[PDB]
Amino acid sequence: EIRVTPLGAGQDVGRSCILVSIAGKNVMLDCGMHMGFNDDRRFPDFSYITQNGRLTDFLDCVIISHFHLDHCGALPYFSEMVGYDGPIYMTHPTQAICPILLEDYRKIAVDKKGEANFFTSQMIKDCMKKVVAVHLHQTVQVDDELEIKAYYAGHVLGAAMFQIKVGSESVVYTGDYNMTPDRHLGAAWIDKCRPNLLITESTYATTIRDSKRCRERDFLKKVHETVERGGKVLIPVFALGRAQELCILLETFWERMNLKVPIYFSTGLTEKANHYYKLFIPWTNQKIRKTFVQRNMFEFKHIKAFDRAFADNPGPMVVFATPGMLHAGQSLQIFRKWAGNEKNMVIMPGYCVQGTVGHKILSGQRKLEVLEVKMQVEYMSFSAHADAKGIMQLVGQAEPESVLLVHGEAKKMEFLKQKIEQELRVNCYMPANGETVTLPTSPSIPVGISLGLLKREMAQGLLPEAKKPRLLHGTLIMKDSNFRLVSSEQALKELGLAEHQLRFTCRVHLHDTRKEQETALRVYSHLKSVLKDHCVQHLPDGSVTVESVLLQAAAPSEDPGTKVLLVSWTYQDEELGSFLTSLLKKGLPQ
Amino acid sequence: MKLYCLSGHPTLPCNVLKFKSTTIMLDCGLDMTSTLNFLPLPLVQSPRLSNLPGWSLKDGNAFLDKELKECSGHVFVDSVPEFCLPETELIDLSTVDVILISNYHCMMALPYITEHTGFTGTVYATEPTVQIGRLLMEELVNFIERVPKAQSASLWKNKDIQRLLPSPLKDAVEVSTWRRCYTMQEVNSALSKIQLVGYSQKIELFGAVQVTPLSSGYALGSSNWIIQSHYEKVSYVSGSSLLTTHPQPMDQASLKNSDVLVLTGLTQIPTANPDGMVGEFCSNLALTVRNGGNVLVPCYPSGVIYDLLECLYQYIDSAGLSSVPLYFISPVANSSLEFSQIFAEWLCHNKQSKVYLPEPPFPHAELIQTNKLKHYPSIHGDFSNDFRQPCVVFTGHPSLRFGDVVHFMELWGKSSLNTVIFTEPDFSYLEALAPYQPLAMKCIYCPIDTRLNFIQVSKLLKEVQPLHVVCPEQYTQPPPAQSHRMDLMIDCQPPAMSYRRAEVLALPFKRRYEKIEIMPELADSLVPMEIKPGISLATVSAVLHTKDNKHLLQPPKPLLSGSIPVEQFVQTLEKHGFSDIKVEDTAKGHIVLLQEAETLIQIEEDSTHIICDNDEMLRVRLRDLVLKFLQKF
Amino acid sequence: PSKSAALHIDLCKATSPADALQYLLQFARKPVEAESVEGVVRILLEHYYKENDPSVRLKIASLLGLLSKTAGFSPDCIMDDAINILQNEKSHQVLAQLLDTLLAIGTKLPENQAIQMRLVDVACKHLTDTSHGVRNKCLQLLGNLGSLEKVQKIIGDYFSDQDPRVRTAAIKAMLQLHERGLKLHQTIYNQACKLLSDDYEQVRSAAVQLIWVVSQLYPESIRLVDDAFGKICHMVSDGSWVVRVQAAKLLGSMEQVSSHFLEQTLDKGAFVHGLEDEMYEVRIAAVEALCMLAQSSPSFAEKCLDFLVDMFNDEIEEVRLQSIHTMRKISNNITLREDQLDTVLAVLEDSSRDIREALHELLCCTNVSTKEGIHLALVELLKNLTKYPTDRDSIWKCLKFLGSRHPTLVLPLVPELLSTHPFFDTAEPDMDDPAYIAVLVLIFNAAKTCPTMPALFSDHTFRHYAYLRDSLSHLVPALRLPGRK
Numbered sequence A: 001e002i003r004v005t006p007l008g009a010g011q012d013v014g015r016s017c018i019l020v021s022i023a024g025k026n027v028m029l030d031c032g033m034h035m036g037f038n039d040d041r042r043f044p045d046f047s048y049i050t051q052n053g054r055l056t057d058f059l060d061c062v063i064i065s066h067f068h069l070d071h072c073g074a075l076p077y078f079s080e081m082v083g084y085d086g087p088i089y090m091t092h093p094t095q096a097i098c099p100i101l102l103e104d105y106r107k108i109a110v111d112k113k114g115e116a117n118f119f120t121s122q123m124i125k126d127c128m129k130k131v132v133a134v135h136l137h138q139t140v141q142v143d144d145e146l147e148i149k150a151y152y153a154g155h156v157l158g159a160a161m162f163q164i165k166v167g168s169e170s171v172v173y174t175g176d177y178n179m180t181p182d183r184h185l186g187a188a189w190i191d192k193c194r195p196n197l198l199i200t201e202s203t204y205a206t207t208i209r210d211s212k213r214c215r216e217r218d219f220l221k222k223v224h225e226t227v228e229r230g231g232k233v234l235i236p237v238f239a240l241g242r243a244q245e246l247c248i249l250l251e252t253f254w255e256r257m258n259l260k261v262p263i264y265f266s267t268g269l270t271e272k273a274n275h276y277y278k279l280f281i282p283w284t285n286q287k288i289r290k291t292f293v294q295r296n297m298f299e300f301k302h303i304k305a306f307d308r309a310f311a312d313n314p315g316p317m318v319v320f321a322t323p324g325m326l327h328a329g330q331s332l333q334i335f336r337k338w339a340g341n342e343k344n345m346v347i348m349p350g351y352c353v354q355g356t357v358g359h360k361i362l363s364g365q366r367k368l369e370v371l372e373v374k375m376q377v378e379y380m381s382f383s384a385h386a387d388a389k390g391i392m393q394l395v396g397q398a399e400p401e402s403v404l405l406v407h408g409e410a411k412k413m414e415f416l417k418q419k420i421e422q423e424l425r426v427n428c429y430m431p432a433n434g435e436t437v438t439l440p441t442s443p444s445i446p447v448g449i450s451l452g453l454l455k456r457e458m459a460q461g462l463l464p465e466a467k468k469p470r471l472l473h474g475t476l477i478m479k480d481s482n483f484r485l486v487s488s489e490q491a492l493k494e495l496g497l498a499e500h501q502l503r504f505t506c507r508v509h510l511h512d513t514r515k516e517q518e519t520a521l522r523v524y525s526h527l528k529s530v531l532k533d534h535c536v537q538h539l540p541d542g543s544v545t546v547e548s549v550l551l552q553a554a555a556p557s558e559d560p561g562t563k564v565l566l567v568s569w570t571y572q573d574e575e576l577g578s579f580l581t582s583l584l585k586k587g588l589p590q
Numbered sequence B: 001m002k003l004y005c006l007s008g009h010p011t012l013p014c015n016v017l018k019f020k021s022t023t024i025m026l027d028c029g030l031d032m033t034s035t036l037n038f039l040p041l042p043l044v045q046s047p048r049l050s051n052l053p054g055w056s057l058k059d060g061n062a063f064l065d066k067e068l069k070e071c072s073g074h075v076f077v078d079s080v081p082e083f084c085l086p087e088t089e090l091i092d093l094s095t096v097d098v099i100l101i102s103n104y105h106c107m108m109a110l111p112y113i114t115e116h117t118g119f120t121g122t123v124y125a126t127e128p129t130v131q132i133g134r135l136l137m138e139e140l141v142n143f144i145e146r147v148p149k150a151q152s153a154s155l156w157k158n159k160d161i162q163r164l165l166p167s168p169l170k171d172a173v174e175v176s177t178w179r180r181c182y183t184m185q186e187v188n189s190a191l192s193k194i195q196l197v198g199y200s201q202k203i204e205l206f207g208a209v210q211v212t213p214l215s216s217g218y219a220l221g222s223s224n225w226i227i228q229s230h231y232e233k234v235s236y237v238s239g240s241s242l243l244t245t246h247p248q249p250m251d252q253a254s255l256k257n258s259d260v261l262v263l264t265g266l267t268q269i270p271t272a273n274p275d276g277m278v279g280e281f282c283s284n285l286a287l288t289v290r291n292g293g294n295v296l297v298p299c300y301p302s303g304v305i306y307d308l309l310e311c312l313y314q315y316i317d318s319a320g321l322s323s324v325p326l327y328f329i330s331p332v333a334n335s336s337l338e339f340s341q342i343f344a345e346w347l348c349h350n351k352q353s354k355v356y357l358p359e360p361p362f363p364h365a366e367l368i369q370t371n372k373l374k375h376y377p378s379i380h381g382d383f384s385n386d387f388r389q390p391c392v393v394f395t396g397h398p399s400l401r402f403g404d405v406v407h408f409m410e411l412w413g414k415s416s417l418n419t420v421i422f423t424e425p426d427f428s429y430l431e432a433l434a435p436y437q438p439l440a441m442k443c444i445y446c447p448i449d450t451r452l453n454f455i456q457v458s459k460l461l462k463e464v465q466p467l468h469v470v471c472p473e474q475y476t477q478p479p480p481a482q483s484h485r486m487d488l489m490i491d492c493q494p495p496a497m498s499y500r501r502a503e504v505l506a507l508p509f510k511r512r513y514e515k516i517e518i519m520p521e522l523a524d525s526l527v528p529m530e531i532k533p534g535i536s537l538a539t540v541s542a543v544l545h546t547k548d549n550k551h552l553l554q555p556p557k558p559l560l561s562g563s564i565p566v567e568q569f570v571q572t573l574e575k576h577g578f579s580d581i582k583v584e585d586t587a588k589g590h591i592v593l594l595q596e597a598e599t600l601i602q603i604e605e606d607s608t609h610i611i612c613d614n615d616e617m618l619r620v621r622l623r624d625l626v627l628k629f630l631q632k633f
Numbered sequence C: 001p002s003k004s005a006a007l008h009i010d011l012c013k014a015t016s017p018a019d020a021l022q023y024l025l026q027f028a029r030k031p032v033e034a035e036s037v038e039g040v041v042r043i044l045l046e047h048y049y050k051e052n053d054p055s056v057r058l059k060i061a062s063l064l065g066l067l068s069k070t071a072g073f074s075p076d077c078i079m080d081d082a083i084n085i086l087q088n089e090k091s092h093q094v095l096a097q098l099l100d101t102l103l104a105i106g107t108k109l110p111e112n113q114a115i116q117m118r119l120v121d122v123a124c125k126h127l128t129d130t131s132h133g134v135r136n137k138c139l140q141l142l143g144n145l146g147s148l149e150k151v152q153k154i155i156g157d158y159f160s161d162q163d164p165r166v167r168t169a170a171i172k173a174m175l176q177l178h179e180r181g182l183k184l185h186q187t188i189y190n191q192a193c194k195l196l197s198d199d200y201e202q203v204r205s206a207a208v209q210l211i212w213v214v215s216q217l218y219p220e221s222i223r224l225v226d227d228a229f230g231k232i233c234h235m236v237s238d239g240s241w242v243v244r245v246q247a248a249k250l251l252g253s254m255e256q257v258s259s260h261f262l263e264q265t266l267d268k269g270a271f272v273h274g275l276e277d278e279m280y281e282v283r284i285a286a287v288e289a290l291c292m293l294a295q296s297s298p299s300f301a302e303k304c305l306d307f308l309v310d311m312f313n314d315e316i317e318e319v320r321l322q323s324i325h326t327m328r329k330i331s332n333n334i335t336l337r338e339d340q341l342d343t344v345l346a347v348l349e350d351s352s353r354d355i356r357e358a359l360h361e362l363l364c365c366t367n368v369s370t371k372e373g374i375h376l377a378l379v380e381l382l383k384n385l386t387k388y389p390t391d392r393d394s395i396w397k398c399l400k401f402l403g404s405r406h407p408t409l410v411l412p413l414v415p416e417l418l419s420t421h422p423f424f425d426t427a428e429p430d431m432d433d434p435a436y437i438a439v440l441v442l443i444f445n446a447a448k449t450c451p452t453m454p455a456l457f458s459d460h461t462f463r464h465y466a467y468l469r470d471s472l473s474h475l476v477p478a479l480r481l482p483g484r485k
Ligand SMILES: [Zn+2]
Pocket: A066, A068, A071, A155, A175, A176
């Protein structure tokens, strides 16, 4: 029995929280922030599981997919006042990059609201102390049966899907994987391991993405046209994210074309990227594990530094500022400063979350508080999430017994289900916000076995007598520390009740005028003729051997019209002896 | 369960293990001590090496004047240095299935076995091990390549010549199996069949077995392996440093609950003191640069030199000797320092907490923003117009037979003003100076070893005690140098085992208890039939689905035990309807007669014997009656 | 003599793990016998055959197989090995020794009939072990011993056995059967198409080869090669990279396919994912595949054209070199409308000597249908000349072949490329400047066919033609100018 409950990201993006229970183990899959409205409902309702009490006794381990604000978002609230002294299992690069990123979001929050209720720095460092770093393809035992297992995905730096094994039951949480390879990131790879449930992201499922070169040739020609009109290419994109891929892309274009434009880079996390990608190449793509000895591809000889006083410059100006959803304020300072202009250009990086300016401009309206739309937009989609082909690839390569679709929206939810039931014939389900999806999993019991039993089993099996029931045997013993299956004679000698050799004998009383030697010959002929594929032989002393059954012509009885035939057999051929007695009751031919 | 031993050198091992059906060949070390028997390879010819007297046997029959040449009472064979490979002919190595690699020091023999045998299997290693192994392979093939030498020497391998050769040339094992160096194509192909494993990755092989690494701490990327089923576990430790070092610390948890703890890869010299020994390094290096003159350090491109650089950097801030420069000359130098910089999560836990902060883990970066460490690919270029006397120079291969180390071992080896600082074990100190004597170059044997010595070997063995111990005789027998003392040995009290080069050993534990899995319908169709307290019993009957070496059980004879009481038998016969049943007694049994169905039954100790007439329903009734008064097994 | 002495020494010493292993190792490592007496030494090998410690027996029979590899013996060793297999069948080590000896004897020299490849194969097939003892290696025994040009059923029912290793060896036996001909059947296609999802590595990398071979046997299933090629394209998307290499290469062994499904590979998806995943192995295999299937298909070639121009920034010199090759092979009736800018700025590199000469080989065999493309190609190659005064001969060859390939496109360039001011006198350019020579050799190689070009020169240009014809006769061709008749 496995239960799963989405405390967010079911039919939603942001506040991605999943609680899974496997055989009495409660595991927290992912926790982020809603990336949206300013009320109390951007942080998940912790009272759904505990209300007024402790969370340590219920929840065992905490798993973080990557460092997105919808996936590394609400970490201080688990650690400090809602409280969790237990382990926070998450990868090395994500542990390197979440603290400064949530510090940046703290700066945004205190600049927005001026609120001391968001969190402080001493407490986020306290959250960062009790975090256990997890490597690449790697097992970690949590207490004594709960295995956690991290696999390379490729969504951002240090982006991994996770796998949880309790006994023999496995659940796979896949955060924001991309089967399509990136430029400094690779692809996703999970070994097919008969997974019970696959928690899969389905952000992009209505559309099939083309080749990558379509994406950058479209984006680059539109950028080229914008700078040809003198427009200033302002990309509302967030931190590390798709930021450095668009950086290296623009750097390649501006260095192969040799056109002059004073591009800059956002404040705060500015050189943090430079030292953070130069210490985590083994998590990156295999192009730059081999091509890094020449120079620093991650150090840019064309980018420069932005500050608050350069926003009024005319001429060409291709700078990007955080975030990607246009909700922080400094990008909103740029956007509100640049609202009444037709010559410039803003853009959107990827998907958008409800309630933000990004979704508000994705709908296609004008007023924003009102800021009428004079800019131009184009749905460029470098945001590294797998398309429906990626869904096909990961699901068909993992081949799970059940799936669960999160981190998306309803139309592609129904589309992607109906596709998954029509082709791979697996129990695809709808999760929503709050309900408990239950899968009754098949239990597994491992027992032991003796070497001799499998030795004679393979010796009999590889002989050409297959495809029919061979009916193996043995007996099973309870010690409540191990459950043991042992062969029969070894069980006789270990329990010590001795080999009980059995002699079942019976007198076949035949009423006919034939002689007793002729009667024994008739019995031998009848048993040879009726029993096909049976070792029926006649002994030289008038006896008949049928496997382990002995038939002897006994002494004549006191009745002249009655003849006595002794039939003896053991319990190993008890059914054969019963059939022989039935046939001899049916009568010899006469 | 057979261990085939193919390498005789204690810390460059090769061990095939036939387990269930696997043929796991642990480690491929290439014995380079054979290369000490040759003349060096200078990139430019010296008048000294060219003009040496050729040794002649007293018989004079053989043409060995041009074969081997003598120098200062020590003779060496003049050709390309040969390499001491393991036996590729003891067992058919195409039947080797998976090769496991512990560290980069035991990977140098991989191209020979992987492209000259027929080995179609896979090799597994951690990615730091494969990266530094690739760089060391390129190092070796480049230094052996640069100036070609043809193997024109062949007659010294025959039996009577080699026993008529003098020492140390008598001390050579299987010179006929020695083979020249390897080329580009099998460098590229040997690093294609390799796969990338993580530190304690639970990785299965062929559906049969499980292999997994552990942290070792001997070097950056070193691994100690475990081959196990669910009911047995043979572990292979090769190189560990529980002394305070840079990589991830040793794991003591997956070593216990094991039966074999093969002690490959211990220290070269037990009598050492590494902290004081690198103190001695700093001492004589400081003395030589204080007198004014360079120091020469033979070194691998990776490994302990990294540690050396750290303390040496620190010692500059204690010595006021920032004037003397640091040079690293190697064809893989920039890539070596790069891979030192980047492979950082595999370091210590507090070194991981240093990676928490945006700072470089290895402090040679701080040596290069201070313009202290200068790395060059070769002398052929930027080193010519930047060289500064006096200096500290780190050179090529420490065997002192090929690289740039031969050039600086010449030229500067003329005055007592300078010194050379040997720092790396598993190469003999006096044997390295043997082609270079007579010589005025100052020499200090200052070897830095990080491998655990016999005291912590004893601590390890009393910590995670196995059922069996496998090690070479160099660990059992007292060492040839300090043979007078018993103390620094293996100290265990099971009977330890000893393997020589190319030996077969049967591991004395037999597989007897293997593993089976059951689908739940059968599990619910079983009943417990508890008969003797604490000990339950159940009848099991199924079919066994065979697939991928993990056997299952699917739905498609139990016997009798327990003597039957005759009195209860006749009582239940009388109460079931049967009548007029008469019982008589014998010496040890009872004869009971039923006049219906003409039945006579005799009962004795552990014996029953029914005899009936031609009946079916009464026969099967008696069957179910007598089988329900006992216990089924 | 020496063999008898070694046998006597081994019998006299008679140590179990000490004398036998060391003596056998010394006998193997020292020298080969290279005589018929080694067969007599095989009788000595029969002398130590009846002994315990089966590792020594395995080593001895391995030495026997090594002696059989020297072709010293013939049928007597085969009979002795058959007797040893039928008598000394004791566990996996002796089974390995006997089957290795049988494999060596079968391919030693004769490889013929009359109990040389049939009786041994029958003995191998009749001695299948119960668990891995001979199974994979007796399958390769029955592989290399072809019975007659008619026995595939025993391999056929062994596609679904236990061990994946035995599956791989059954596959390799099926390979070696196909390499001898033997007229393979049709049910192998069914057993192979059910063999893709074996859920484990090292079988799919050869299952794709089995799909290829039974597909190019004959294309008659319902259409056969389209479904097989679609399965191969599905195997291109596998996570493992060795199977991707094998899938791309073994589809690169194909030569026939339906056209429409071949354009289906790129839209609605194999080559759209078959390139940008791994190191040079997958990429070079896929682009050799597009080489052959652009050579076989006269159509489609604009699609492989613009799927090669994207992959210029792969940061591998081998990928660049073999990419220049993979589009120089397919440069037939193919023009470059917009994708010529990247292929001419790709020359911009520090040394790239092999890459540069490959690029000059590409530029002299390409076809183009525009004028501004000629202008940009010429100005970029002159910039290459002014940055590297090293390869003037190579650029003279490629400009000669560029002029010879298409003369028409450069007719409007001559009023623009050189100083031909209408009323000002054109000064005589520097003759020894080895950059004006390149544009002259273009001009006069393009002036061989078009008649409207002698009227467009000047007097100094005819005297330059005179000196270029008399000096570099292998660069400029002979023209019908009145100055040089
Ligand atoms: Zn994400």
